[PDB]
């Protein structure tokens, strides 16, 4: 909704967010008590990697190695305060806010591989109960890619 | 003379058991003393400082803790018997007690950290100052590397530059150049909080800023930040000590006090430019640490679209508007 | 004694950090001269170094145990005895 200057800065900020998310490893599924619980947790993991994945790409296709710049410039702790700033009102206590205390260490800054992305999508089809919204989105996200979805 | 500083060093020994007798050797001191302020009072300063040097020359840690307590009941057995004068700080050598305190908390901060890489940089740092007795007794030693530990910092830096010449940078070699950054840092964090409970040193810090700048050129993202929050932790202790020395000196001989300003001001500019590539999320804290250095935080607000930051800067400021 | 002295023999060829660390753990198992041996062993701890191991054994202990001037009884002995006054501190 906002202007262009805010868009780029915000998309820059968002690119970092999606990146942080994608980096997060697949959760330890074996560690759950039951079959239903663990399958659920994994399902969400696939959803995270898939959604963030396509976003990371669509934002990185704008420019050449656009992702590298995002990390090299905002991975700095200065970005953490610029993120808290744009998202929240600074008046709230910045101590008990998880966003301000997270240890952003060694962002992979590696664009996602299509083959990995496919198995993330396929595993997350049941993430949103297969709403035609979900699939029509994925199908469109793959509409710009050189590899087609299964 | 030596007969005097060996007579108060004998009255402090009794100043742990009782006082009456020691208070009469301080009373014999005030009547038998010289009492000409300008140097005879800096002849009993050169005595209280020659016994603080010997309580620092003194189970190597529990034995260096017993010595920060000893130099603490020696600073209490001076406040009472008084001991309310003398000061021969001059150049290179009361601030001298605090300083020898601060460096005994530094000696316990690198005693608490003992691993094979620092113990090697220390043995290289002591074999360079002189030879060691090889009758076992190989720390290779500390009780004299305390009265002078300032030197095992400028040498455990020359052993990170020869361990960086072989580093071949390659990832495990940029993890060994940060492990040392983290110790010289929290050894400077230990001298700061020992002052709250109240040109070689500096060169070795501007040397590891530049080597912490060459490495983030090739480094996994997160790591390049932790050594940046570190070189920001360290630069904020140097700029704090040049601020405290400024405030210490004022008025007449001002020419020397406005030439040392230009020197710290050409460095908060050389620490700013250095942080111009780095994250500006730390700029806000570097700008607040040397709480003006506005020219740097004012050009960080200009490079971005934060007309909100340059409004937040002028919102909390004393005449920044006439400055911006 | 026999143990400490046998763990340090020139016969024990592959003697590594653990052989001396344990030859300094068997000193509280005595009941004659303590600090004569404390030296005897730190000294063959260097003969084997061929001026790495001294390094490590000072890394394994965590200090005014070791001697010094008494020891030399030399360029990196003092050199390691400086970042050994920073370590203990």
The torsion of the CA quartet A37, A43, A49, A55, rounded to 10 degrees, works out to: -130
Resolution reached, in Å?
37.0
Among B36, B12, B37, which residue's Cα sits nearest to residue B22?
B12
Local structure of C53: helix, strand or coil: helix
Judge whether B40 and B34 are in contact, CB under 8 Å: yes
Q: Do C86 and B124 touch (CB under 8 A)?
A: no
- What is the number of alpha carbons within 13 Å of residue A88 lying toward its C-beta? 13
B179 in contact with chain C, both atoms CB, cutoff 8 A? no
Local structure of C83: helix, strand or coil: coil
Judge whether A83 and A99 are in contact, CB under 8 Å: yes
Judge whether A99 and A17 are in contact, CB under 8 Å: no
Among B273, B286, B199, B272, which residue's Cα sits nearest to residue B236?
B286
Per-residue b/e over B172-183, b at no fewer than 16 CB within 10 Å?
eebeebbebbeb
Give the burial class of C70: count Cβ atoms within 10 A of its Cβ; 0-12 exposed, 13-18 middle, 19 or more buried: middle
Specify the length of chain C in residues. Answer: 89
Judge whether B152 and C86 are in contact, CB under 8 Å: yes
CB-closest option in A77, A107, A108 to B279:
A77
How far is B307 from B303, CA to CA, in rounded Å?
Answer: 10
Give the burial class of B21: count Cβ atoms within 10 A of its Cβ; 0-12 exposed, 13-18 middle, 19 or more buried: exposed
Within 8 A by CB and 6+ apart from B205, the residues are B184, B234, B235, B238
How far is C89 from C85, CA to CA, in rounded Å?
Answer: 6
Give the burial class of A133: count Cβ atoms within 10 A of its Cβ; 0-12 exposed, 13-18 middle, 19 or more buried: exposed
Experimental technique of record:
cryo-EM
Among B87, B37, B52, which residue's Cα sits nearest to residue B248?
B87
Give the burial class of B222: count Cβ atoms within 10 A of its Cβ; 0-12 exposed, 13-18 middle, 19 or more buried: middle
How far is B185 from B204, CA to CA, in rounded Å?
Answer: 12
- Surface of B (36-65) touching C: CB under 8 A: 59-61, 63-64
How far is B255 from B238, CA to CA, in rounded Å?
Answer: 22
- Annotate chain A with three-state secondary structure: CCCHHHHHHHHHHHHHHHHHHHHCCCCCCCCCCCHHHHHHHHHHHHHHHHHHHHHHHHHHCCCCCHHHHHHHHHCCHHHHHHHHHHHCCCCCCCCCCHHHHCCCCCCCCCCCCHHHHHHHHHHHCCCCCCCHHHHHHHHHHHHHCCCCCC
Residue entry with tokens 């001989």: B253
User: In degrees, to the nearest 5, what angle opens at C-alpha A105 toward C-alphas B219 and B204?
Assistant: 55
Structure tokens that stand for B242 in this block: 């040049």
Residue entry with tokens 């290289």: B124
**Rama region for B36: left / alpha / beta (φ>0; ψ in -120 to 50; rest):** beta
- Annotate chain B with three-state secondary structure: CCCCHHHHCCCCCCCCCCCCCCCCCCHHHHHHCCCCCCCCCCCCHHHHHHHHCCCCCCCCCHHHHHHHHHCCCCCHHHHCCCCCCCCCCCCCCCHHHHHHHHHHHHHCCCCCCCCCCHHHHHHHHHCCCCCCCCCCCCCCCCHHHHCCCHHHCCCCCCCCCCCCCCCCCCCCCCCHHHHHHHHHHHCCCCCCCCCCCCCCCCHHHHHHHHHCCCCCCCCCHHHHHHCCCHHHHHHHHHHHHHHHHHCCCCCCCHHHCCHHHHHHHCCCCCCCCHHHHCCCCCHHHHHHHCCCCHHHHHHHHHHCCCCCHHHHHHHCCCCCCCCC
Q: Do B123 and C65 touch (CB under 8 A)?
A: no
Residue entry with tokens 């004299």: B144
How far is A91 from C64, CA to CA, in rounded Å?
Answer: 54
How far is A72 from A53, CA to CA, in rounded Å?
Answer: 19
Q: Which of chain A's residues have a Cβ under 8 Å away from the Cβ of B283?
A: 78
């Amino acid at each position: 909704h906002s202007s262009n200057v805010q868009w780029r800065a915000l998309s820059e900020l968002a690119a970092l967010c999606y990146l942080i998310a994608f980096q997060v490893p697949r959760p330890k599924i074996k560690l759950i008590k039951g079959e239903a619980g663990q399958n659920l947790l994994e399902m969400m993991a696939c959803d995270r990697l898939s959604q963030s994945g396509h976003m990371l790409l669509n934002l990185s296709r704008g420019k050449q190695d656009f992702l590298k710049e995002i990390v090299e410039t905002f991975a700095n702790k200065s970005g953490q305060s610029a993120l808290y700033d744009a998202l929240f009102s600074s008046q709230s206590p910045k101590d008990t806010s998880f966003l301000g205390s997270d240890d952003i260490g060694n962002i992979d800054v590696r664009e996602p591989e299509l083959e990995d992305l496919t198995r993330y999508d396929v595993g997350a089809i049941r993430a949103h109960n297969g709403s035609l919204q979900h699939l029509t989105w994925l199908g469109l996200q793959w509409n710009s890619l050189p590899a087609l979805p299964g | 003379k030596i007969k005097l500083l060996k007579a108060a060093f004998l009255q402090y020994c009794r100043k742990d058991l009782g006082h009456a007798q020691m208070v009469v050797d301080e009373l014999f001191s005030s009547h038998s003393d010289l009492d000409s302020d300008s140097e005879l009072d800096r002849a009993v300063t050169q005595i209280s400082v020659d016994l603080m040097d010997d309580y620092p020359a003194s189970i190597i840690l529990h034995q260096l803790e017993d010595k920060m307590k000893a130099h603490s009941f020696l600073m209490d057995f001076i406040h009472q018997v008084g001991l309310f004068g003398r000061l021969g700080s001059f150049p290179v050598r009361l601030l001298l007690c605090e300083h020898a305190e601060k460096l005994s908390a530094a000696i316990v901060l690198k005693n608490h950290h003992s691993r094979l890489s620092d113990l090697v940089n220390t043995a290289i740092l002591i074999a360079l100052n002189k030879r060691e007795y090889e009758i076992p007794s190989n720390l290779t030693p500390a009780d004299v590397f305390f009265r002078e530990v300032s030197q095992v910092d400028t040498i455990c830096e020359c052993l990170l530059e020869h361990e960086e010449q072989v580093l071949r940078d390659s990832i495990e070699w940029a993890e060994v150049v940060i492990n040392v950054n983290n110790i010289l840092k929290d050894m400077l964090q230990a001298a700061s909080h020992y002052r709250q409970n109240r040109r070689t040193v500096i060169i070795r810090q501007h040397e590891i800023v530049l080597k912490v700048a060459y490495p983030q050129a090739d480094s996994n993202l997160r790591n390049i930040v932790t050594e940046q929050l570190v070189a920001l932790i360290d630069c904020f202790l140097d700029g704090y000590v040049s601020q405290l020395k400024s405030v210490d000196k004022s008025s007449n001989r001002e020419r020397y006090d406005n030439l040392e300003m230009e020197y710290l001001q050409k460095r908060s500019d050389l620490l700013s430019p250095l942080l111009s590539l780095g994250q500006y999320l730390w700029a806000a804290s570097l700008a607040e640490k040397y709480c003006d250095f506005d020219i740097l935080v004012q050009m960080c607000e200009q490079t971005d679209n934060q007309s909100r930051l340059q409004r937040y800067m002028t919102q909390f400021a004393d005449q920044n508007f006439s400055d911006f | 004694p026999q143990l400490i002295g046998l763990y340090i023999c020139e016969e024990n060829r592959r003697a590594n950090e653990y052989d001396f660390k344990k030859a300094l753990d068997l000193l509280e198992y005595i009941d004659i001269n303590i600090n004569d041996l404390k030296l005897e062993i730190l000294c063959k701890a260097l003969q084997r170094d061929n001026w790495v191991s001294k390094d490590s054994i000072f890394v394994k202990i965590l200090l005014p145990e070791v001697k010094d001037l008494l020891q030399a009884d030399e360029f990196v002995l003092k050199a390691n005895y400086e970042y050994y006054v920073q370590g203990q501190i």
